[PDB]
Amino acid sequence: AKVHGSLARAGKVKSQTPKVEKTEKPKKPKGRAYKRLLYTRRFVNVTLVNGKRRMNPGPS
Amino acid sequence: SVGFGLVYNSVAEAKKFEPTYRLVRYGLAEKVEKASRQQRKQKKNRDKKIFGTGKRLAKKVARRNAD
Amino acid sequence: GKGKPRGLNSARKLRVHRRNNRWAENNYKKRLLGTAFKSSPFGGSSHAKGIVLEKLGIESKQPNSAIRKCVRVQLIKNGKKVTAFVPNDGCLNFVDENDEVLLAGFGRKGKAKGDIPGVRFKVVKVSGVSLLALWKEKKEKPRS
Amino acid sequence: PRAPRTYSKTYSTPKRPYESSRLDAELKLAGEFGLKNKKEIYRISFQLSKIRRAARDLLTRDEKDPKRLFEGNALIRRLVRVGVLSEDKKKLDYVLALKVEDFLERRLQTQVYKLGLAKSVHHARVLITQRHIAVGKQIVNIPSFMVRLDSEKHIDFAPTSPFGGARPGRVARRNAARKAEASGE
RNA sequence: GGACUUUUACUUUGAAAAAAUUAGAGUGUUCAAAGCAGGCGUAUUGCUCGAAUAUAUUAGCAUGGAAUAAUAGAAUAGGACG
RNA sequence: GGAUAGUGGCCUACCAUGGUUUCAACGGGUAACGGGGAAUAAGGGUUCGAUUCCGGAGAGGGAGCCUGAGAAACGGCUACCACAUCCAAGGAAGGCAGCAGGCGCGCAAAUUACCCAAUCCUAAUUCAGGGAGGUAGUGACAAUAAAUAACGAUACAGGGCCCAUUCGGGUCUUGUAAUUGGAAUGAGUACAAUGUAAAUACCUUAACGAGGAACAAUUGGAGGGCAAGUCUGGUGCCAGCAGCCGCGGUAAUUCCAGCUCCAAUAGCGUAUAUUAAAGUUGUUGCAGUUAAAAAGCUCGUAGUUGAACUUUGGGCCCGGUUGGCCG
Ligand SMILES: [Mg+2]
Ligand SMILES: [Mg+2]
Ligand SMILES: [Mg+2]
Ligand SMILES: [Mg+2]
Ligand SMILES: [Mg+2]
Ligand SMILES: [Mg+2]
Ligand SMILES: [Mg+2]
Ligand SMILES: [Mg+2]
Ligand SMILES: [Mg+2]
Ligand SMILES: [Mg+2]
Ligand SMILES: [Mg+2]
Ligand SMILES: [Mg+2]
Ligand SMILES: [Mg+2]
Ligand SMILES: [Mg+2]
Ligand SMILES: [Mg+2]
Ligand SMILES: [Mg+2]
Ligand SMILES: [Mg+2]
Ligand SMILES: [Mg+2]
Ligand SMILES: [Mg+2]
Ligand SMILES: [Mg+2]
Ligand SMILES: [Mg+2]
Ligand SMILES: [Mg+2]
Ligand SMILES: [Mg+2]
Ligand SMILES: [Mg+2]
Ligand SMILES: [Mg+2]
Ligand SMILES: [Mg+2]
Ligand SMILES: [Mg+2]
Ligand SMILES: [Mg+2]
Ligand SMILES: [Mg+2]
Ligand SMILES: [Mg+2]
Ligand SMILES: [Mg+2]
Ligand SMILES: [Mg+2]
Ligand SMILES: [Mg+2]
Ligand SMILES: [Mg+2]
Ligand SMILES: [Mg+2]
């Protein structure tokens, strides 16, 4: 069907999303320590068992 | 430190049977330096363009200073 | 026994029969006919670099409504003209015209990809500088 | 024109990329023996995989076959030597079984901790790579060393470094240099 | 040494067989991928284990088998032995 | 007969009419050098091999030849063809599919460095020569090992647990903590020795070298397949996503971001090809009434295939290798 359509709007939404800067955060350990940090988080102490389990829970 | 060593039956014996870079390391032999390896090659190739001793070719090219 | 000869001396027939019937295999057929070398815009190779002629407004297929930003490209080694897609958002701002671009396949083995009709290629680099990199802030587009 | 330098890869990778059960089972193993990689598990499974293959093939052969007896015993005696294989099950129908942890349990990473000396699997790691401890007077910085079980008795701190005693070292001697300089003349 | 022998397939064992690669034994390259080293002493005048084995399939050669499947024979007797 | 080192239609003379083919000759294609081998792991297979070893062929394209034991040689010559360089215009000269290096070509690939110390080769030869070869430089081709942190104390909090009439925190650690604590090491830097032909790195090792401004890990993804949010902001069938199914037209679990989370991690994404998944090429092992597929019918050569039957049964002997009960 149609081939020449308007090019004017190219980049529209990315150009108009309000920029918010990355916020400075504690540096996460790289390597074995991160695996460790996962292990103790995922298994040892756990967190919440509600209904099954949850990894990245929001306002629950 | 694991390593290797030799002991010759005399110092004359060593000097004749030893790699010449070792006698250098020790100081039993002087390092006589020469032109670059690719400098020598170039010298040879230049020499190849001359048949004979060539000092006779120095006079005939001196005649060119006239003509 | 339904067809195939079970005999101990029938090896020839059994070979020849398979040979014949391989041609009904799409992949086998392409490979021997040399379709890649003969047809197809790329020489059979993985990428091809070419030059931008015009910037197209190709409209999406149904049930989708959009305008997909694409460019008509003339491959250097060929002369073959090809329309390719310029991925992500903006990025058609990076291209312009008579520019050098690096085209790559769309993954579908020929076979144009999405709601984008007839476009079998996509842009990877422009002016040697890699659309991805341009798109974030990482690199900048060269002089001329 | 030189003979090719030969090489081989020491690991294999799981086909199903996301399997929640395998992942959990994987992490625990790492979190226990103190591994930074899934590859450090992948490697062992690959080594184990080839061993089981050899074992498998040997079993199909007739009992008391010359190849089977020779190669079979070698595999067994190798496995027993390092301490993966139990003395009680020596006959290789158990090498067919085995399992991963039996290999992991023998790493110098783990032996240094199992013996005390560390009191963490992670403290174990850092000590080893830091040019501490040893087998002989020979230092070993690789956590994967696979203690040979008759060398098990000789795991101890190095003749060098502190903890085996040498000299406190730059981080400590720095403070000792700040103690006598600030407080004294 | 003489005098003659119906033709094949299949299977067995063996000879002839480059190395590197593969499988694989031995050996603690600090581990490992590797390498083919090395290991012991009187470490002042030497002792010493190694550098295996397997695969190598069609064809050709050599040998054992005689089931399976072919081939040839004696009927115008122009048959067989002496 | 001639010719060759020599067999031979290799060539010539005379004579004859032969030679190959559906068991596929002849011809065509090959983005074809052959092989040892490579990739893919139930097996049977499939695909690949320009390229470290072996064999062959070539030296811009053809032909011809000198030398010699050996060449139809090309870092030898002669001629033609195509390139192409120097000049005083008369003439003369070149052949990188050797090492580096340049242009062109493209998706696609490194230094105009050092040395004969090793590995070996050649010569009249222990010595000379060797861009063979080694050395370093460039180098995320592929391959191996594996740093980016370890340990306490303390501040509430908890789950344990003995007691619970009821305050609870007490010593066994689970750790989330926005103040703390001294310990440790190489990444780098660097005397020195080691290393090396001489250097460089490595292995050693004085002096230095860690607290968040760091010596600060990435690359993709978070609707389904598929592991991880229905969080907040933005846009409003636009911009864009999306291998495939599908998202976006104003509360978007797919876009643009912030936060948080997942997977692999010194690596991870993409494109193209191939292999496994594929019993969707099927010998093992497919399907053909209606899903793709039995020729309208019968004859029939090539091909494949093809009933049963011919020394079986019984007797005697010899000596091997496992395994038992015993040693
Ligand atoms: Mg020279
Ligand atoms: Mg001369
Ligand atoms: Mg058809
Ligand atoms: Mg649809
Ligand atoms: Mg157009
Ligand atoms: Mg072209
Ligand atoms: Mg055989
Ligand atoms: Mg005729
Ligand atoms: Mg044919
Ligand atoms: Mg070709
Ligand atoms: Mg080849
Ligand atoms: Mg081939
Ligand atoms: Mg080619
Ligand atoms: Mg021609
Ligand atoms: Mg020639
Ligand atoms: Mg040349
Ligand atoms: Mg030559
Ligand atoms: Mg003149
Ligand atoms: Mg060159
Ligand atoms: Mg490259
Ligand atoms: Mg060179
Ligand atoms: Mg870092
Ligand atoms: Mg820091
Ligand atoms: Mg990210
Ligand atoms: Mg899920
Ligand atoms: Mg929203
Ligand atoms: Mg998001
Ligand atoms: Mg991957
Ligand atoms: Mg079969
Ligand atoms: Mg089917
Ligand atoms: Mg129908
Ligand atoms: Mg039908
Ligand atoms: Mg019919
Ligand atoms: Mg017919
Ligand atoms: Mg029959």
Curated annotation (Swiss-Prot), chain A:
Pfam families: Ribosomal_S30. GO terms for cellular component: cytoplasmic stress granule; cytosol; cytosolic small ribosomal subunit. The modification Phosphothreonine is found at residue 47. InterPro entries: Ribosomal_eS30. Keywords: Cytoplasm, Phosphoprotein, Ribonucleoprotein, Ribosomal protein. GO terms for molecular function: structural constituent of ribosome. The keyword Cytoplasm applies. The modification Phosphoserine is found at residue 15. Residues 1-34 are annotated as: Disordered. The keyword ATP-binding does not apply. Its main location: cytoplasm. It is found in: Cytoplasm. One of its GO terms (biological process) is cytoplasmic translation. PANTHER family: 40S RIBOSOMAL PROTEIN S30/UBIQUITIN-LIKE PROTEIN FUBI, RIBOSOMAL PROTEIN S30, ISOFORM A. Component of the small ribosomal subunit (SSU). Mature yeast ribosomes consist of a small (40S) and a large (60S) subunit. The 40S small subunit contains 1 molecule of ribosomal RNA (18S rRNA) and 33 different proteins (encoded by 57 genes). The large 60S subunit contains 3 rRNA molecules (25S, 5.8S and 5S rRNA) and 46 different proteins (encoded by 81 genes). Present with 37600 molecules/cell in log phase SD medium. Belongs to the eukaryotic ribosomal protein eS30 family. This is Small ribosomal subunit protein eS30A.
From Swiss-Prot, chain B:
One of its GO terms (molecular function) is structural constituent of ribosome. N-terminally acetylated by acetyltransferase NatA. Also partially acetylated by NatC. GO terms for biological process: cytoplasmic translation; maturation of SSU-rRNA from tricistronic rRNA transcript (SSU-rRNA, 5.8S rRNA, LSU-rRNA). Its main location: cytoplasm. Residues 37-47, 56-67 have a biased composition (Basic residues). It comes from the Eukaryota. Keywords: Acetylation, Cytoplasm, Isopeptide bond, Phosphoprotein, Ribonucleoprotein, Ribosomal protein, Ubl conjugation. Component of the small ribosomal subunit (SSU). Mature yeast ribosomes consist of a small (40S) and a large (60S) subunit. The 40S small subunit contains 1 molecule of ribosomal RNA (18S rRNA) and 33 different proteins (encoded by 57 genes). The large 60S subunit contains 3 rRNA molecules (25S, 5.8S and 5S rRNA) and 46 different proteins (encoded by 81 genes). Component of the ribosome, a large ribonucleoprotein complex responsible for the synthesis of proteins in the cell. The small ribosomal subunit (SSU) binds messenger RNAs (mRNAs) and translates the encoded message by selecting cognate aminoacyl-transfer RNA (tRNA) molecules. The large subunit (LSU) contains the ribosomal catalytic site termed the peptidyl transferase center (PTC), which catalyzes the formation of peptide bonds, thereby polymerizing the amino acids delivered by tRNAs into a polypeptide chain.
Swiss-Prot record, chain C:
One of its GO terms (biological process) is maturation of SSU-rRNA from tricistronic rRNA transcript (SSU-rRNA, 5.8S rRNA, LSU-rRNA). Present with 10600 molecules/cell in log phase SD medium. It is found in: Cytoplasm. Belongs to the universal ribosomal protein uS12 family. Coiled coil: none annotated. Hydroxylation at Pro-63 affects translation termination efficiency. The stereochemistry of the 3,4-dihydroxyproline has not yet been determined. The keyword Ribonucleoprotein applies. The gene is RPS23A. Component of the small ribosomal subunit (SSU). Mature yeast ribosomes consist of a small (40S) and a large (60S) subunit. The 40S small subunit contains 1 molecule of ribosomal RNA (18S rRNA) and 33 different proteins (encoded by 57 genes). The large 60S subunit contains 3 rRNA molecules (25S, 5.8S and 5S rRNA) and 46 different proteins (encoded by 81 genes). Pfam families: Ribosom_S12_S23 (PF00164). This is Small ribosomal subunit protein uS12A. There is a cross-link at residue 55 (Glycyl lysine isopeptide (Lys-Gly) (interchain with G-Cter in ubiquitin)). It comes from Saccharomyces cerevisiae (strain ATCC 204508 / S288c). GO terms for cellular component: cytosol; cytosolic small ribosomal subunit; ribosome. Changing residue 63 to A: Lethal mutation. The modification 3,4-dihydroxyproline is found at residue 63. The keyword Ubl conjugation applies. One of its GO terms (molecular function) is structural constituent of ribosome. Keywords: Cytoplasm, Hydroxylation, Isopeptide bond, Ribonucleoprotein, Ribosomal protein, Ubl conjugation.
Swiss-Prot record, chain D:
Residues 159-185 are annotated as: Disordered. PROSITE patterns: RIBOSOMAL_S4 (PS00632), S4 (PS50889). Keywords: Cytoplasm, Isopeptide bond, Nucleus, Phosphoprotein, Ribonucleoprotein, Ribosomal protein, Ribosome biogenesis, RNA-binding, rRNA processing, rRNA-binding, Ubl conjugation. Residues 106-180 form the S4 RNA-binding domain. GO terms for molecular function: rRNA binding; structural constituent of ribosome. It is found in: Cytoplasm; Nucleus, Nucleolus. CDD domains: S4. GO terms for cellular component: 90S preribosome; cytoplasm; cytosol; cytosolic small ribosomal subunit; nucleolus; nucleoplasm; small-subunit processome. There is a cross-link at residue 179 (Glycyl lysine isopeptide (Lys-Gly) (interchain with G-Cter in ubiquitin)). SMART domains: Ribosomal_S4, S4. The keyword Phosphoprotein applies. PANTHER family: 30S 40S RIBOSOMAL PROTEIN, 40S RIBOSOMAL PROTEIN S9. Component of the ribosome, a large ribonucleoprotein complex responsible for the synthesis of proteins in the cell. The small ribosomal subunit (SSU) binds messenger RNAs (mRNAs) and translates the encoded message by selecting cognate aminoacyl-transfer RNA (tRNA) molecules. The large subunit (LSU) contains the ribosomal catalytic site termed the peptidyl transferase center (PTC), which catalyzes the formation of peptide bonds, thereby polymerizing the amino acids delivered by tRNAs into a polypeptide chain. Present with 106000 molecules/cell in log phase SD medium. There are 2 genes for uS4 in yeast. Belongs to the universal ribosomal protein uS4 family. This is Small ribosomal subunit protein uS4A. The lineage of its organism: Eukaryota, Fungi, Dikarya, Ascomycota, Saccharomycotina.
